PDB file of N, CA and C in Angstrom:
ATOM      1  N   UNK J  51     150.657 108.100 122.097  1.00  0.00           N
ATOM      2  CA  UNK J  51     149.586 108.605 122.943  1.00  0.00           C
ATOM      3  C   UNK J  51     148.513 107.538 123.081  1.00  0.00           C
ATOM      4  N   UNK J  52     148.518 107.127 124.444  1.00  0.00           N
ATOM      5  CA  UNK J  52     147.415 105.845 124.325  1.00  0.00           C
ATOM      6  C   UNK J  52     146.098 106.497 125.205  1.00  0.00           C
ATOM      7  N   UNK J  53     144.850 106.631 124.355  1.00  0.00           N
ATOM      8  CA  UNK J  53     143.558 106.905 124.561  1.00  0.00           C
ATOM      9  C   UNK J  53     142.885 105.592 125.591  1.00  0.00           C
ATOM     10  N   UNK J  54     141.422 105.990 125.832  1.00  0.00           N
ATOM     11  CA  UNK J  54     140.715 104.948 126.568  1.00  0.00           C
ATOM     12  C   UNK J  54     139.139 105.884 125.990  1.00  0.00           C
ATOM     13  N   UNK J  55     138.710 104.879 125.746  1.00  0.00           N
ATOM     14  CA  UNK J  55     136.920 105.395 124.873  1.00  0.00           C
ATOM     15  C   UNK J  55     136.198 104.932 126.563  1.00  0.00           C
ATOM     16  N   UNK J  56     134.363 105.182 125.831  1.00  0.00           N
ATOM     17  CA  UNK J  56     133.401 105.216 126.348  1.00  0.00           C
ATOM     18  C   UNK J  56     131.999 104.578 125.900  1.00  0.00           C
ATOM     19  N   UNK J  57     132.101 103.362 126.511  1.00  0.00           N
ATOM     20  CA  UNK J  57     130.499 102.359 125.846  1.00  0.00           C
ATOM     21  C   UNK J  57     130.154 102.118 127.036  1.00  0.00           C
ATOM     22  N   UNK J  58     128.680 101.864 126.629  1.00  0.00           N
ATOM     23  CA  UNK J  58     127.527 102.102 127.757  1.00  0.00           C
ATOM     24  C   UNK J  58     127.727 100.060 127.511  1.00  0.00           C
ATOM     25  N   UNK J  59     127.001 100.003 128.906  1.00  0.00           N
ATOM     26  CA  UNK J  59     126.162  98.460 128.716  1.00  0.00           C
ATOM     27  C   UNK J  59     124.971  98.193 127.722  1.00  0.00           C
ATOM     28  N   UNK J  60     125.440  96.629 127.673  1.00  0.00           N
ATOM     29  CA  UNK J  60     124.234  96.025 126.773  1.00  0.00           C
ATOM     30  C   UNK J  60     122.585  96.230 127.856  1.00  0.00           C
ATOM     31  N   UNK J  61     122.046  96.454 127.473  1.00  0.00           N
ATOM     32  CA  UNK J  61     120.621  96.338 128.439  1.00  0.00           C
ATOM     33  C   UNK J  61     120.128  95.275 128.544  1.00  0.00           C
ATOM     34  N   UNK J  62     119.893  95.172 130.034  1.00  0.00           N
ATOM     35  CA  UNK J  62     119.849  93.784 129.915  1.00  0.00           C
ATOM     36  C   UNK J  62     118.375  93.597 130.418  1.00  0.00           C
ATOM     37  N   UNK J  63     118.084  92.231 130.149  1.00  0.00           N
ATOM     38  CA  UNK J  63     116.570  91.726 130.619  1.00  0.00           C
ATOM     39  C   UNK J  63     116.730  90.473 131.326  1.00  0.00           C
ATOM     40  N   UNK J  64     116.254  90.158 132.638  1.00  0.00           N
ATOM     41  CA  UNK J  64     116.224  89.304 133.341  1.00  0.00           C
ATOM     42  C   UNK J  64     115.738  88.459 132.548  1.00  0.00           C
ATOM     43  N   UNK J  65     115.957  87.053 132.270  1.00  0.00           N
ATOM     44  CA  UNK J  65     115.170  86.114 131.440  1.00  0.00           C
ATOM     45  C   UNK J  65     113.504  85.739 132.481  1.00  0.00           C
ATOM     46  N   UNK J  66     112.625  84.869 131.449  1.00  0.00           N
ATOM     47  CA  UNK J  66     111.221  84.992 131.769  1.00  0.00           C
ATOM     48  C   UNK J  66     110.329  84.535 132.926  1.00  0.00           C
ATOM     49  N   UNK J  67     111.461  83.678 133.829  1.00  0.00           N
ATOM     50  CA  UNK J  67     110.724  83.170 134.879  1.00  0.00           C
ATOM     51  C   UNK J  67     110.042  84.225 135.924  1.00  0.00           C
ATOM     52  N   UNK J  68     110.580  85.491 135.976  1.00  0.00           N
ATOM     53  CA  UNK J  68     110.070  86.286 136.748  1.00  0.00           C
ATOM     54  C   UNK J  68     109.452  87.209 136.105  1.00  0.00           C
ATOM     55  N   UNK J  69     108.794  86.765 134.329  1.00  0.00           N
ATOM     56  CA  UNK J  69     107.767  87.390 134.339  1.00  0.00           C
ATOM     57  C   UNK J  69     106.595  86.293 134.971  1.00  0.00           C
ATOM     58  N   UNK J  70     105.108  86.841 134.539  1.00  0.00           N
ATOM     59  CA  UNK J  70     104.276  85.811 134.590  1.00  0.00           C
ATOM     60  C   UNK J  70     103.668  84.898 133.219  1.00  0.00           C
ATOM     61  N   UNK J  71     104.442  85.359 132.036  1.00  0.00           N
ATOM     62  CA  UNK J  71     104.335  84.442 131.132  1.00  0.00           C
ATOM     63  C   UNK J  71     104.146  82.836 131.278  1.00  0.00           C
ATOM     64  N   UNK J  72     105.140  82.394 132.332  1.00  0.00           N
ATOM     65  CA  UNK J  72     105.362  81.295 132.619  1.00  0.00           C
ATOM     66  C   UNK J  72     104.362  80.514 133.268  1.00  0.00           C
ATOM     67  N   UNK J  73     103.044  81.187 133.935  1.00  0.00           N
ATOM     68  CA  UNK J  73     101.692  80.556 133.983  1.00  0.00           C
ATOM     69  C   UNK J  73     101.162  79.886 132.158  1.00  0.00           C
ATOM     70  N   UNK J  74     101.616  80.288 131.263  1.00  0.00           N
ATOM     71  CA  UNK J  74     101.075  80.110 130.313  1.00  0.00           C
ATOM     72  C   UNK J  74     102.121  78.753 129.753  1.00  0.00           C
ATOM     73  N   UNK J  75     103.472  78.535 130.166  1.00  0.00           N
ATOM     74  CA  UNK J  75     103.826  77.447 129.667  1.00  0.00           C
ATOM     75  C   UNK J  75     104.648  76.765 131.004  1.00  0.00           C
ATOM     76  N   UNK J  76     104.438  75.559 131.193  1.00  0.00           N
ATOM     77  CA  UNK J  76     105.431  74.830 132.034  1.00  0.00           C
ATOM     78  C   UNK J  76     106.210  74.526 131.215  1.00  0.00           C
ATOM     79  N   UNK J  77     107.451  74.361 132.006  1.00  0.00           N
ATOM     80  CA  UNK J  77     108.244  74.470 131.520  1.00  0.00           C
ATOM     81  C   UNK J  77     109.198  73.455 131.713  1.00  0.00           C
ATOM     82  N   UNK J  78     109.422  72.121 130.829  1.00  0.00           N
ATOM     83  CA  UNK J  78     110.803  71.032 131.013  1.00  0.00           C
ATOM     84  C   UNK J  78     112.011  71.454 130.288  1.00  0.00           C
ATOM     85  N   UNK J  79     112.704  71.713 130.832  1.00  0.00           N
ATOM     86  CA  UNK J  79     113.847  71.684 129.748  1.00  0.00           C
ATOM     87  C   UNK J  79     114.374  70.555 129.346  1.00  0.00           C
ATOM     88  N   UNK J  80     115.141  70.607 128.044  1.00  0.00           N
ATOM     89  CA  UNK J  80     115.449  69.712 127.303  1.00  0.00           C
ATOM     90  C   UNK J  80     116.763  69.373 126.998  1.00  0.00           C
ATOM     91  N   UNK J  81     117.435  68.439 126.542  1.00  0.00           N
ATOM     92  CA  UNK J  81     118.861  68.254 126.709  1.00  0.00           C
ATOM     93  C   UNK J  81     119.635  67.965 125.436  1.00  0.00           C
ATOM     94  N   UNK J  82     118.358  67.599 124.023  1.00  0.00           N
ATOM     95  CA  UNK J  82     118.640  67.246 123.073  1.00  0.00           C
ATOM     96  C   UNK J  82     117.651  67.572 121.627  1.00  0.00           C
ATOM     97  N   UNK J  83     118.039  68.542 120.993  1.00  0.00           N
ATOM     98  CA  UNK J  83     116.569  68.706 119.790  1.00  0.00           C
ATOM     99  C   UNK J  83     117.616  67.867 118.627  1.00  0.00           C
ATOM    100  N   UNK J  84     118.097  67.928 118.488  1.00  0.00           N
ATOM    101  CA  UNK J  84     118.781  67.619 117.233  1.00  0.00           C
ATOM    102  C   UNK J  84     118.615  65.988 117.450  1.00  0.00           C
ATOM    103  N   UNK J  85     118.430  65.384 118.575  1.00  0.00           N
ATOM    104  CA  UNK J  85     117.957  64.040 119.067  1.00  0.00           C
ATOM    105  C   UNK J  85     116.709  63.692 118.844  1.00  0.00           C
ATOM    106  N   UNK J  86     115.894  64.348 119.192  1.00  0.00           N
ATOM    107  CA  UNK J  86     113.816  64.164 118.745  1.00  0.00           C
ATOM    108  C   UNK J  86     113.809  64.670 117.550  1.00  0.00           C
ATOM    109  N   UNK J  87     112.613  63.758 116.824  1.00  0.00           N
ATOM    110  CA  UNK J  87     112.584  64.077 115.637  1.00  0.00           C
ATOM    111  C   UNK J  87     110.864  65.276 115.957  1.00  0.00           C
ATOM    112  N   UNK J  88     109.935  63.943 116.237  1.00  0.00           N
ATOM    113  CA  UNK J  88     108.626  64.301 116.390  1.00  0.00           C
ATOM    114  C   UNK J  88     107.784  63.385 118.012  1.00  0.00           C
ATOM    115  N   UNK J  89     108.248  64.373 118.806  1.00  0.00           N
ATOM    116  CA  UNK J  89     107.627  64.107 119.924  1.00  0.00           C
ATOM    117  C   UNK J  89     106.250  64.133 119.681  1.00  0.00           C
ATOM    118  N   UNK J  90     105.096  63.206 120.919  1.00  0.00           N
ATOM    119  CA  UNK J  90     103.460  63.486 120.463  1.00  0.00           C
ATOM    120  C   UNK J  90     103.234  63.087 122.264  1.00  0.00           C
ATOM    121  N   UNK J  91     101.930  63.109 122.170  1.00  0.00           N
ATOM    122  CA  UNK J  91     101.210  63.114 123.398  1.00  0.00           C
ATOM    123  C   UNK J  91      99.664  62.616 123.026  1.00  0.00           C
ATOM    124  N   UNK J  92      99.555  61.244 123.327  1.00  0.00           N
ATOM    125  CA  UNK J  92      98.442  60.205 123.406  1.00  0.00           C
ATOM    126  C   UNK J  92      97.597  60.706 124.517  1.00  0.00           C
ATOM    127  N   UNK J  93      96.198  60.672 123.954  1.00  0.00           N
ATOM    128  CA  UNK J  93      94.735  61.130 124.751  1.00  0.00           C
ATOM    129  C   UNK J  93      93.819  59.710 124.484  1.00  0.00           C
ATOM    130  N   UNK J  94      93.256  59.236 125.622  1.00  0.00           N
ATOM    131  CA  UNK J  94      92.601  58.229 125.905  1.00  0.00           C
ATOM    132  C   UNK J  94      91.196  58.521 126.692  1.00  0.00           C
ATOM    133  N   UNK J  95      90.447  58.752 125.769  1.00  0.00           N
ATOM    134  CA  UNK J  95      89.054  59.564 126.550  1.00  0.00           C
ATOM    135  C   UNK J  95      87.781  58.565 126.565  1.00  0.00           C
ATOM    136  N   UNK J  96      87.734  57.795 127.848  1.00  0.00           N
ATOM    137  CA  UNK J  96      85.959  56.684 127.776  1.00  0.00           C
ATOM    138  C   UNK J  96      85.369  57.967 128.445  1.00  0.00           C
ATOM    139  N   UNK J  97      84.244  57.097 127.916  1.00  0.00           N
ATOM    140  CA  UNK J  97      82.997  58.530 127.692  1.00  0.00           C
ATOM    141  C   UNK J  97      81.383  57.907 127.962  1.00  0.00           C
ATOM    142  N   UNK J  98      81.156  57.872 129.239  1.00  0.00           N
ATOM    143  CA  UNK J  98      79.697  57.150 129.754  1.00  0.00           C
ATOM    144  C   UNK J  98      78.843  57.694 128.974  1.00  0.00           C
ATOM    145  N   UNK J  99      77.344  57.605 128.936  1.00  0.00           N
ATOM    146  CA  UNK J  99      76.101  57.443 128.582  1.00  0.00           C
ATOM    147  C   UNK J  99      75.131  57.188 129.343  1.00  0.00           C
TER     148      UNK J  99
ATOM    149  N   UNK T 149     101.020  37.335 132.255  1.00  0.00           N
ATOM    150  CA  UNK T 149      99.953  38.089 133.512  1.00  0.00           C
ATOM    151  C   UNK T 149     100.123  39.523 133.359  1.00  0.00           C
ATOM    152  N   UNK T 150     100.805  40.136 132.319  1.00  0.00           N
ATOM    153  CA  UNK T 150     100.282  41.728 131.715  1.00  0.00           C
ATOM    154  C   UNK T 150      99.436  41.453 130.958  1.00  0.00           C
ATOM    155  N   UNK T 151      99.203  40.298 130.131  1.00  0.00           N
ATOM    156  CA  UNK T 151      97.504  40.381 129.169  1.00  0.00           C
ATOM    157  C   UNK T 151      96.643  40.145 130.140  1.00  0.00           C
ATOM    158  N   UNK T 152      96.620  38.843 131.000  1.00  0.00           N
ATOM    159  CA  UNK T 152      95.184  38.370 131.896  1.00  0.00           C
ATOM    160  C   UNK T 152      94.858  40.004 133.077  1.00  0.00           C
ATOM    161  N   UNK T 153      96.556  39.849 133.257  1.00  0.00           N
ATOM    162  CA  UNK T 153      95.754  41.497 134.258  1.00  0.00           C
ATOM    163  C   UNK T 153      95.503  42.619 133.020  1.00  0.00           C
ATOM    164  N   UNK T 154      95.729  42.530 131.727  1.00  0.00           N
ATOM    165  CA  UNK T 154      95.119  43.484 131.239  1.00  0.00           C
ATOM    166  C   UNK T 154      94.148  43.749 129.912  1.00  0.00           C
ATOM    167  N   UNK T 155      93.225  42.496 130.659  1.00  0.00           N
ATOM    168  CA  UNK T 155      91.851  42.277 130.399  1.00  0.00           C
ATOM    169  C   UNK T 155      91.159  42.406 131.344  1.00  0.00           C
ATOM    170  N   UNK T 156      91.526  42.121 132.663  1.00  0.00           N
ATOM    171  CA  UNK T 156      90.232  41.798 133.658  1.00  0.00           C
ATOM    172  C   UNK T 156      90.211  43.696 134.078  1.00  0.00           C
ATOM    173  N   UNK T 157      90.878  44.618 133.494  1.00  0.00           N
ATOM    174  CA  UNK T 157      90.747  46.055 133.534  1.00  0.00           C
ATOM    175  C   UNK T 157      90.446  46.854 132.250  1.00  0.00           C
ATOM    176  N   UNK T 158      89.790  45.869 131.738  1.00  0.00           N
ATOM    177  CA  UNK T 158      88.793  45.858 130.441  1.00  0.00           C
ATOM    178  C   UNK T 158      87.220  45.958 131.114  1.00  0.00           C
ATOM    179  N   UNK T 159      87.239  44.430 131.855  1.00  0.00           N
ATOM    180  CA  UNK T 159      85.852  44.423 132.048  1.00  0.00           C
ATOM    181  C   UNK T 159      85.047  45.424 133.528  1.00  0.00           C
ATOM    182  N   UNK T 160      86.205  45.406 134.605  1.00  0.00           N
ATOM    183  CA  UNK T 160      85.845  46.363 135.431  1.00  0.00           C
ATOM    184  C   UNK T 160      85.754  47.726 134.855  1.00  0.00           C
ATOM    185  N   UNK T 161      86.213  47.814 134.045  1.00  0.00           N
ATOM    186  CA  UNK T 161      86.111  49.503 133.029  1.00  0.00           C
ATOM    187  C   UNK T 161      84.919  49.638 132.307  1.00  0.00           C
ATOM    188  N   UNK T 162      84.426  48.157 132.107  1.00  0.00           N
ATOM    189  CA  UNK T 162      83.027  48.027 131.475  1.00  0.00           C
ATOM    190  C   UNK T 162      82.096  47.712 132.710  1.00  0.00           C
ATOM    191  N   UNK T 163      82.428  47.523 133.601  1.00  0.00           N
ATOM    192  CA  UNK T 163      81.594  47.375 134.809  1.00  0.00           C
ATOM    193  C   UNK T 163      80.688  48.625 135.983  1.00  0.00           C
ATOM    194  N   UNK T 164      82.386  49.198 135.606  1.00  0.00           N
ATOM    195  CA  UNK T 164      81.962  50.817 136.170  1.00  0.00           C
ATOM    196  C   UNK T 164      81.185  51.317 135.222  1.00  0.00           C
ATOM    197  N   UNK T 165      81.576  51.376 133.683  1.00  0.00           N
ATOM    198  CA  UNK T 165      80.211  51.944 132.971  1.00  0.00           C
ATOM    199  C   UNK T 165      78.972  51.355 133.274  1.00  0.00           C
ATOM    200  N   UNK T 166      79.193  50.142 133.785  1.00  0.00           N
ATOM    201  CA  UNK T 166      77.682  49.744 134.317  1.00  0.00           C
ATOM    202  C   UNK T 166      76.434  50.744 135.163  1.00  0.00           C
ATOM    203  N   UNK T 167      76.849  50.332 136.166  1.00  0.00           N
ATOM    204  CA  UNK T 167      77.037  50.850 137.115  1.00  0.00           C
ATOM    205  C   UNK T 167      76.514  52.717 136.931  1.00  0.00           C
ATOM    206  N   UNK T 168      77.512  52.989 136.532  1.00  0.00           N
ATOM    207  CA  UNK T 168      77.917  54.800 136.567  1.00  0.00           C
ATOM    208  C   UNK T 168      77.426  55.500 135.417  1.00  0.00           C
ATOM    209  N   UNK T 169      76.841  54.482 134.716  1.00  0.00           N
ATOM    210  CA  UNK T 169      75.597  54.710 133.454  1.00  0.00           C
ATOM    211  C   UNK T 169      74.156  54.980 134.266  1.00  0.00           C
ATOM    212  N   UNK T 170      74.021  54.039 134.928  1.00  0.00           N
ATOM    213  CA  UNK T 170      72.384  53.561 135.442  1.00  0.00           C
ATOM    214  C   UNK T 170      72.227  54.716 136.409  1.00  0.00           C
ATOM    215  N   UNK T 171      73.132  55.697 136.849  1.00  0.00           N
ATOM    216  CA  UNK T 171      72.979  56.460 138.099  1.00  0.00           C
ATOM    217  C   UNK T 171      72.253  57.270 137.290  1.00  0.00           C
ATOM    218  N   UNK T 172      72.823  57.851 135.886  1.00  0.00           N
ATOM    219  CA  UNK T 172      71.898  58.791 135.467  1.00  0.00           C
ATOM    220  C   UNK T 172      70.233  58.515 135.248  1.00  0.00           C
ATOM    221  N   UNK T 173      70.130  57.608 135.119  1.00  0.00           N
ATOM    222  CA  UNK T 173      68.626  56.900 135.024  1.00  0.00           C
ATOM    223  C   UNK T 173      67.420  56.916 136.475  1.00  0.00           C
ATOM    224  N   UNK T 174      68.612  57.444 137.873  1.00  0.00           N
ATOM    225  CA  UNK T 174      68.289  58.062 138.420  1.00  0.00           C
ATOM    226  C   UNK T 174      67.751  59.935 138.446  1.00  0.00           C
ATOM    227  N   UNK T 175      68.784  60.229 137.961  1.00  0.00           N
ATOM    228  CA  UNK T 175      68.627  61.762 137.542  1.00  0.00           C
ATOM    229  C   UNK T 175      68.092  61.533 136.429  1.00  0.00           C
ATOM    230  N   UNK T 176      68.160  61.203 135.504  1.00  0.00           N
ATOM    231  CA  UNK T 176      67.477  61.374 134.269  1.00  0.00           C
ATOM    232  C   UNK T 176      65.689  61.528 134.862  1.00  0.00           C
ATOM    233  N   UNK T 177      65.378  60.500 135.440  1.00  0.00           N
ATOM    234  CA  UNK T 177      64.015  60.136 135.350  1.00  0.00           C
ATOM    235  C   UNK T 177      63.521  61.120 136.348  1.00  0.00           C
ATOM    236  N   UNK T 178      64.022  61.250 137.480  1.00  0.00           N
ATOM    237  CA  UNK T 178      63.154  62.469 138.715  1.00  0.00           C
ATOM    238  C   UNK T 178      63.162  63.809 138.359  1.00  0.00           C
ATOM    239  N   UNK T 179      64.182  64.298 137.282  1.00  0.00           N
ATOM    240  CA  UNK T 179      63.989  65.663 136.403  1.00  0.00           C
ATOM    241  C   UNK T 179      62.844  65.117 135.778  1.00  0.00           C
ATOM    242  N   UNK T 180      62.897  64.394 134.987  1.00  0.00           N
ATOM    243  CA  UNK T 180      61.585  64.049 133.807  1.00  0.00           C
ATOM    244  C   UNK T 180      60.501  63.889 134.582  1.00  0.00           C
ATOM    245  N   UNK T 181      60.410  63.344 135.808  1.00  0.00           N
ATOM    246  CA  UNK T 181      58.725  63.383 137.136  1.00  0.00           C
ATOM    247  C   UNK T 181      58.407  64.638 136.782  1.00  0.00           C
ATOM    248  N   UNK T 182      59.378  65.748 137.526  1.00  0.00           N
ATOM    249  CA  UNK T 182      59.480  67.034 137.861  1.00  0.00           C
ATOM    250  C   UNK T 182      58.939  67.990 136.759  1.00  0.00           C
ATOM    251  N   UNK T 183      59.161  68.106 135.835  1.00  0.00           N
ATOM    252  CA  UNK T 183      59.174  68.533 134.115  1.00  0.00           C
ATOM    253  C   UNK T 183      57.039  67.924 133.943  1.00  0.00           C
ATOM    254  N   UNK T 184      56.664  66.810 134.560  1.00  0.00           N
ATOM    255  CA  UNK T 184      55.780  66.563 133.961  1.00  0.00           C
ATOM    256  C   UNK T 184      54.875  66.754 135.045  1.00  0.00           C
ATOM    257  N   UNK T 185      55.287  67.244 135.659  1.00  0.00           N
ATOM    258  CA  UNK T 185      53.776  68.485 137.275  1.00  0.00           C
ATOM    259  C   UNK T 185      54.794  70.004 137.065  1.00  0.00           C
ATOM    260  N   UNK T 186      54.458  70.070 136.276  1.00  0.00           N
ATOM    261  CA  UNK T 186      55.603  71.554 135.680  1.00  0.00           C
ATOM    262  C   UNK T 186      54.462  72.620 135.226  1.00  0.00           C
ATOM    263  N   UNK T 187      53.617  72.799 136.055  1.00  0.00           N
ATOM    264  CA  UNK T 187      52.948  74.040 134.875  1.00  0.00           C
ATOM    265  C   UNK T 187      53.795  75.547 135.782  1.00  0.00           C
ATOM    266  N   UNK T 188      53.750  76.128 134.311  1.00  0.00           N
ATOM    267  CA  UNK T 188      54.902  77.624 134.412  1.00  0.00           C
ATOM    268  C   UNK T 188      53.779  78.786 135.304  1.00  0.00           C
ATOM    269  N   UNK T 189      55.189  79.975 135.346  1.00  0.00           N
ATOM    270  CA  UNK T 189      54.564  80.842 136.307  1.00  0.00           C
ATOM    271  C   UNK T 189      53.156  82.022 136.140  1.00  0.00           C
ATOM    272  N   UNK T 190      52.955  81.839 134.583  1.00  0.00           N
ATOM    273  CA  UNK T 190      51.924  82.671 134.218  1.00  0.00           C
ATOM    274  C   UNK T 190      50.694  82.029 134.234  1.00  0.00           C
ATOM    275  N   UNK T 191      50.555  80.571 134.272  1.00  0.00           N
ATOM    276  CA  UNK T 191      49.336  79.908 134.680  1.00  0.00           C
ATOM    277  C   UNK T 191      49.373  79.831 136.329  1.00  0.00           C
ATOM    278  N   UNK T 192      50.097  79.770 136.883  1.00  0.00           N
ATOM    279  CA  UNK T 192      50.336  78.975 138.602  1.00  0.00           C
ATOM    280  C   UNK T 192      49.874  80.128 139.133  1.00  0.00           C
ATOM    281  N   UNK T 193      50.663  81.384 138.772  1.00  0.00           N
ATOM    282  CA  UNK T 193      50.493  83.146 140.051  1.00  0.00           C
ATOM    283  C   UNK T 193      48.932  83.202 140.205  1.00  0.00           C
ATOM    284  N   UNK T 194      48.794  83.646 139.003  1.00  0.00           N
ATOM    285  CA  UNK T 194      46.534  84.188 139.196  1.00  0.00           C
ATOM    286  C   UNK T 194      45.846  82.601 140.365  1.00  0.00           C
ATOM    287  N   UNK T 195      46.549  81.707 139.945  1.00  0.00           N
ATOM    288  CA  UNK T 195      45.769  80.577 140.697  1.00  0.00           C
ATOM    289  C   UNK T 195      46.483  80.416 142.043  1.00  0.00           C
ATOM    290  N   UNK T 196      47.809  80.540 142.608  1.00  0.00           N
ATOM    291  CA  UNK T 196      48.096  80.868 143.819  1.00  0.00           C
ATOM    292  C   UNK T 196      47.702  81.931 144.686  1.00  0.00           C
ATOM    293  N   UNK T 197      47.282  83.239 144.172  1.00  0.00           N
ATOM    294  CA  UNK T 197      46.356  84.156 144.721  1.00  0.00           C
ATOM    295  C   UNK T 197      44.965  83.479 145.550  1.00  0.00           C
TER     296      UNK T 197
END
């Protein structure tokens, strides 16, 4: 006697670009973490008087 | 000629501070005129009447 069951879907969530989170981060994607150790970002500020 | 051109954007960088310093010495000083024929509104009203 061969049966057949009943499961619902996983629920799903559109991923975040179409929330508006994404005002809060731009966004590059990346191709390698296990490649960067410690990325940084240099600030160079002259300052009149 | 990456050091000589990148010195002579040393001194124009010190040039514009020249320059873009002394403007405030414009504003600085015609607020400070202004400030010193400054009497406030509780002496000026009874005497503008």
């Amino acid at each position: 006697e061969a049966l057949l069951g009943v499961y619902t879907n996983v629920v799903e969530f559109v991923k975040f670009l179409e929330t508006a989170l994404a005002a809060a981060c731009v966004n590059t994607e990346f191709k390698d973490l296990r490649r960067m150790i410690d990325g940084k970002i240099q600030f160079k500020i002259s300052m009149p008087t | 000629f990456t050091e000589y051109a990148g010195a002579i954007k040393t001194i124009t960088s010190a040039l514009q501070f020249g320059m873009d310093a002394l403007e405030r010495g414009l504003v600085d000083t015609v607020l400070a005129v202004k400030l010193r024929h400054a009497p406030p509104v509780f002496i000026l009203k009874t005497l503008g009447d």
